Design an enzyme around this catalytic site. Structure first.
Site, PDB file in Angstrom:
ATOM      1  N   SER A 117       0.895  -1.151   0.000  1.00 40.05           N
ATOM      2  CA  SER A 117       0.000   0.000   0.000  1.00 40.05           C
ATOM      3  C   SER A 117       0.956   1.229   0.000  1.00 40.05           C
ATOM      4  O   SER A 117       1.814   1.303  -0.870  1.00 40.05           O
ATOM      5  CB  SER A 117      -1.025  -0.026   1.132  1.00 40.05           C
ATOM      6  OG  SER A 117      -2.050   0.925   0.897  1.00 40.05           O
ATOM      7  N   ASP A 215      -9.968  -5.937  -4.119  1.00 39.78           N
ATOM      8  CA  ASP A 215      -9.387  -4.920  -3.251  1.00 39.78           C
ATOM      9  C   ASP A 215     -10.243  -3.658  -3.367  1.00 39.78           C
ATOM     10  O   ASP A 215     -10.394  -3.099  -4.460  1.00 39.78           O
ATOM     11  CB  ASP A 215      -7.927  -4.646  -3.658  1.00 39.78           C
ATOM     12  CG  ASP A 215      -7.064  -3.885  -2.651  1.00 39.78           C
ATOM     13  OD1 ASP A 215      -7.604  -2.995  -1.943  1.00 39.78           O
ATOM     14  OD2 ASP A 215      -5.833  -4.112  -2.639  1.00 39.78           O
ATOM     15  N   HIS A 245      -7.367  -6.603   0.293  1.00 41.64           N
ATOM     16  CA  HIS A 245      -6.173  -5.757   0.394  1.00 41.64           C
ATOM     17  C   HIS A 245      -4.899  -6.392   0.992  1.00 41.64           C
ATOM     18  O   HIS A 245      -3.863  -6.429   0.328  1.00 41.64           O
ATOM     19  CB  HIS A 245      -6.525  -4.420   1.069  1.00 41.64           C
ATOM     20  CG  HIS A 245      -5.454  -3.368   0.975  1.00 41.64           C
ATOM     21  ND1 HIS A 245      -4.993  -2.904  -0.254  1.00 41.64           N
ATOM     22  CD2 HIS A 245      -4.815  -2.696   1.960  1.00 41.64           C
ATOM     23  CE1 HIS A 245      -4.084  -1.985   0.026  1.00 41.64           C
ATOM     24  NE2 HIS A 245      -3.941  -1.829   1.345  1.00 41.64           N
TER      25      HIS A 245
END
Length: 271
Positions: A117, A215, A245
Site C-alpha cells: 500500500s 481490493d 487488500h
C-alpha cells in the site's frame, strides 16, 4: 528525561535511528546465522507498522537474507503526530538514510525493497530517486491510483482481508492506528499518487506485483496501469481472484502462495 516511544518505552532500550528532522524512528532486524546473500527493506502501509511483517521476514531470513525495517514517521513505535507528514518525500528520505546505513556495514550486497500500500508508493519513489541502485522491488497492493485536523472516517475492517481471524488480530493490535484518514495526510497520499505517475516513465527496477481482484482500497485497475506504464524490463504481475487488500494476511490459500511467490522471485535474483 530520555526519549520515549508514544507507548512510553525509552528508545535506549530499543533498536532505532534519528531522522534528518531529529525524530526517532523505531527499527526492526531479522539477521541470519550465516553470511547474508542480500539485504531487503520492508516498507509498511498507512496505519500499520513493521511488526506486522514478522512471519514474512522470518521466511526471508531463512533464505539467508538480512531483513530490516523501521516504523514510518507518525506510525507504530516511531515519533511524530499520528498519521501526519510535512511532505510525502519525508518517508523516501528516511528509507534512503536507513538503506545507506545498512549498505555501509554490508558493502557490495544487493538491496531489495518490499512495500505494501503506502509502503509500495514509498518503494517506487525510492527506486526512481536512485536509478539502477536496487536489485528488485516486491509490491503487495501498492498505492498507485486514486481546518486541517478533520478525519475521513474509519474504514470497515472487513474490506482488509477475507480471513476473519486476521481482521480480529488487526482490530486488537495497539500499535495499529484504526482512526480515519486525516484530510492533511489525504492530500499527501494524493501527492504520492501524482509522483508515482510522473516517475513511471523512468522506473527501471525489476519488480514483482501481487494484487487482489476484490481490493476495495487499492483498485486492481492501478496494478494493470503500473504494469503498462513502468519501463522495467523485468516485470511480473500476479492476480489473486476474490482476494482483498492485505494479501500477506489473507486466506491460507492466498497467503501460502504469496510467501512461496516472494520466496521464488527473490531467490532467483540472488546467488
Amino acid at each position: 528525561s530520555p526519549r520515549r516511544t508514544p507507548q512510553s518505552i525509552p528508545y535506549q532500550d530499543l533498536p532505532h535511528l534519528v531522522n534528518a528532522d531529529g525524530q526517532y524512528l523505531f527499527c526492526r532486524y531479522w539477521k541470519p546465522t550465516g553470511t547474508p546473500k542480500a539485504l531487503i527493506f520492508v516498507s509498511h502501509g498507512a496505519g500499520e507498522h513493521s511488526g506486522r511483517y514478522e512471519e514474512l521476514a522470518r521466511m526471508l531470513m531463512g533464505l539467508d537474507l538480512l531483513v530490516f525495517a523501521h516504523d514510518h514517521v507518525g506510525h507504530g513505535q516511531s515519533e511524530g503526530e499520528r498519521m501526519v507528514v510535512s511532505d510525502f518525500h519525508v518517508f523516501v528520505r528516511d528509507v534512503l538514510q536507513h538503506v545507506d546505513s545498512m549498505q555501509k556495514d554490508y558493502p557490495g550486497l544487493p538491496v531489495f525493497l518490499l512495500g505494501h500500500s503506502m509502503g509500495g508508493a514509498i518503494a517506487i519513489l525510492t527506486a526512481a530517486e536512485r536509478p539502477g541502485h536496487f536489485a528488485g522491488m516486491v509490491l503487495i497492493s501498492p498505492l498507485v491510483l486514486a481546518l486541517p485536523n478533520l478525519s475521513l472516517g474509519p474504514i470497515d475492517s472487513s474490506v482488509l482481508s477475507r480471513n476473519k481471524t486476521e481482521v480480529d488480530i488487526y482490530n486488537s493490535d495497539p500499535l495499529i492506528c484504526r482512526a480515519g484518514l486525516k484530510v492533511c495526510f489525504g492530500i499527501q497520499l494524493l501527492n504520492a499518487v501524482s509522483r508515482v505517475e510522473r516517475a513511471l516513465p523512468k522506473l527501471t527496477v525489476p519488480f514483482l506485483l501481487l494484487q487482489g481482484s476484490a481490493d476495495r482500497l487499492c483498485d486492481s485497475k492501478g496494478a494493470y496501469l503500473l504494469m503498462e506504464l513502468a519501463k522495467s524490463q523485468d516485470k511480473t504481475l500476479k492476480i489473486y481472484e476474490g482476494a482483498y487488500h492485505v494479501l500477506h494476511k489473507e486466506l491460507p490459500e492466498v497467503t501460502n502462495s504469496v510467501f512461496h511467490e516472494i520466496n521464488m522471485w527473490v531467490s532467483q535474483r540472488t546467488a
